[PDB]
Amino acid sequence: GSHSMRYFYTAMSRPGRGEPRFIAVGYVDDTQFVRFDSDAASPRTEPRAPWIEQEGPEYWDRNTQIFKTNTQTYRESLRNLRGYYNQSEAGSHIIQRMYGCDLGPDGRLLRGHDQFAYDGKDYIALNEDLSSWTAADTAAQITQRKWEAARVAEQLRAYLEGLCVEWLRRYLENGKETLQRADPPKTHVTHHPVSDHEATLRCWALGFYPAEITLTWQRDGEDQTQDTELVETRPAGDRTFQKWAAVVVPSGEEQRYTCHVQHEGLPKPLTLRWEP
Amino acid sequence: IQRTPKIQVYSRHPAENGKSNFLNCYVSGFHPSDIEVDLLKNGERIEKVEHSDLSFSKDWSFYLLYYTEFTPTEKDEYACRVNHVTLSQPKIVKWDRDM
Amino acid sequence: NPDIVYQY
């Protein structure tokens, strides 16, 4: 299947409550495998998936050194961005970074990613070409000029096409029993009368991995997009995810509705109905 | 600047009275990242609650899972109480085993 | 493994 590696960094200032917190998490698909938190009693890169534990001492020391350097760099970036936006020293601000690589089903690089946000708004992003930038505003253009002068895009391209892809392939092999195992959803339809006139039909998908799924209701073979209440896919806490889609149907008309399930772990897409 | 959290309260496994399970409170779609989440049992704060490491979605919004071991029963009421800068008062979302 | 590439 298709796989990706992503790192998510968040630096948050908190004036009057010490220096900005820096947190980094690493994921392979929907599985987190590392964390670093500058607010931990003894900040260090910690394993969060069993297959990463086999990495040696140099791995944990090297990752810690990088995240500790990033902690200092991001506190400087927060100071710079407060000035680029003429903001007072009173408020709390957040910088976020996401980056990583996507591989196709053959293990070949599909594309790289490297983007940033300031206070939850897009700030700067490395374009798909891994050579040019898209700045959201005149403040991000200052960062773009600094990064263009320092050949940052060239270093990121080298990482995204090289080390990102090599480490992702290694993690995929080390954790092949889980990372490369798609667990299909366990599916069922529940019926809940709302009144004498209507009932809710709820189509459940439980125990699936990865998180990507498609769950829809059709009425006489027609998509009920506007009438379906679709909850966000949510983690069960054991690596798996859950999701449901609900439609309110007139009493007696339940057999006109079918629930449709698409998931990587399903050989063929499922069609379910309420089974009274 | 600024997004209110979405809240879901649910069990890890299908709920069976007298059988040990995990009560989850998933908070997502919020910005900034500071958030207060409590799991409640009959309106009282459950003391031993774990949470996932802070992460975020493609739209930059944060998400966290708060969880604890619980044994559901017919009479015990469970809930999740959430406060965020976007909320004037804490939001309570009751656990309903059908959702 | 993370990258080793900057202040804004």
Q: Three-state secondary structure along chain B?
A: CCECCEEEEEECCCCCCCCCEEEEEEEEEEECCCCEEEEEECCEECCCCEECCCEECCCCCEEEEEEEEECCCCCCCEEEEEECCCCCCCEEEECCCCC
Q: Which of A76, A21, A36, A29 is nearest to A51 (CA)?
A: A29
Angle between helices A57-84 and A138-149 (to 10 degrees): 130
Per-residue tokens: A163: 């080390």
What's the distance, CA B85 to chain centroid?
17
Chain A interface includes B14 (CB < 8 A):
yes
Q: Looking at chain B, which residue has its C-alpha nearest residue A240?
A: B12
Residue A21 to residue A11: CA distance in whole angstroms: 6
Residue B16 to residue B21: CA distance in whole angstroms: 8
Q: Looking at chain A, which residue has its C-alpha nearest residue B29?
A: A232
Physical contact, B and C (3 or more Cβ pairs within 8 A): no
Place of tokens 């957040």: A94
Angle between helices A138-149 and A152-161 (to 10 degrees): 80
Residue A124 to residue A140: CA distance in whole angstroms: 6
Among A23, A48, A120, select the one facing B1 at the smallest CB separation: A120
Record: contact A25-B28, CB cut-off 8 A:
no
Which pairs count as long-range contacts for A187-196, CB under 8 Å and 24+ apart, including other chains? A187/A259, A187/A261, A187/A270, A187/A272, A188/A272, A189/A259, A189/A272, A189/A273, A189/A274, A189/A275, A190/A274, A190/B98, A191/A254, A191/A274, A191/A276, A192/B98, A193/A251, A194/A248, A196/A251
- Decide: residue A234, CB within 10 A, 0-12 exposed, 13-18 middle, 19+ buried: buried
To the question of domain A186-272 being in CATH 3.40.640.10, the answer is: no
Place of tokens 């590696």: A5
- Decide: residue B87, CB within 10 A, 0-12 exposed, 13-18 middle, 19+ buried: middle
| One-letter amino acid of A104 | G
Residues 6+ positions from A220 with CB-CB distance below 8 Å: A256
Where along chain A do the CATH 3.30.500.10 domains lie? 3-180
Q: Looking at chain B, which residue has its C-alpha nearest residue A14?
A: B34
Give A90-150 as a DSSP string: TS--EEEEEEEEEE-TTS-EEEEEEEEEETTEEEEEE-TTSS-EEESSHHHHHHHHHHHHT
Record: contact C3-A156, CB cut-off 8 A:
yes
Q: Which residues pair with A260 in a beta bridge?
A: A216, A271
Query: Chain A neighbours among B 65-94 (CB < 8 Å)?
Result: 65, 67
Among A10, A234, A242, select the one facing B54 at the smallest CB separation: A10
Q: Which of A37, A42, A12 is nearest to A24 (CA)?
A: A37
Record: contact A94-B65, CB cut-off 8 A:
no
What residues in C contact A152, CB-CB < 8 Å?
5-6
Q: Output b/e per residue, A200-233; b: 16+ Cβ within 10 A.
A: bbbbbbbbbbbeebebbbbbeeeeeeeebeebeb
Give chain A as a DSSP string: --EEEEEEEEEE--TTSSSPEEEEEEEETTEEEEEEETTSSS---EE-SGGGTTS-HHHHHHHHHHHHHHHHHHHHHHHHHHHHTT--TTS--EEEEEEEEEE-TTS-EEEEEEEEEETTEEEEEE-TTSS-EEESSHHHHHHHHHHHHTTHHHHHHHHHHTHHHHHHHHHHHHTHHHHT--B--EEEEEEEE-SSSEEEEEEEEEEEBSS--EEEEEETTEE-TTT-EEPPPEE-SSS-EEEEEEEEEETT-GGGEEEEEE-TT-SS-EEE----
- Strands B21-30 and B62-70 turn out to be antiparallel
Q: Which of A157, A249, A129 is nearest to A194 (CA)?
A: A249
Residue A13 to residue A94: CA distance in whole angstroms: 6
Q: Looking at chain C, which residue has its C-alpha nearest residue A72?
A: C7
Residue B70 to residue B72: CA distance in whole angstroms: 6
Please, which chains are in contact with A (at least 3 CB pairs closer than 8 A)?
A: B, C
Among B14, B32, B99, select the one facing A92 at the smallest CB separation: B32
- Closest-CA distance, C3 to chain A, in angstroms, reads 7
Q: Looking at chain A, which residue has its C-alpha nearest residue B56?
A: A8
Cα dihedral B94, A120, A155, A160 sign:
positive
What residues in A contact B8, CB-CB < 8 Å?
231-232, 234
Query: What class is the A3-180 domain?
Result: alpha beta
Place of tokens 């293990």: A107
Angle (nearest 5°) at CA B20 between A27 and B11: 50
| Residues B12/B62, Cβ–Cβ less than 8 Å | no
Where along chain A do the CATH 2.60.40.10 domains lie? 186-272
Record: contact A159-C3, CB cut-off 8 A:
yes
Cα dihedral B13, B15, B17, B21 sign:
positive
Record: contact B53-A232, CB cut-off 8 A:
no
CB pairs under 8 A between A and C: 45
- PDB resolution in Å: 1.9
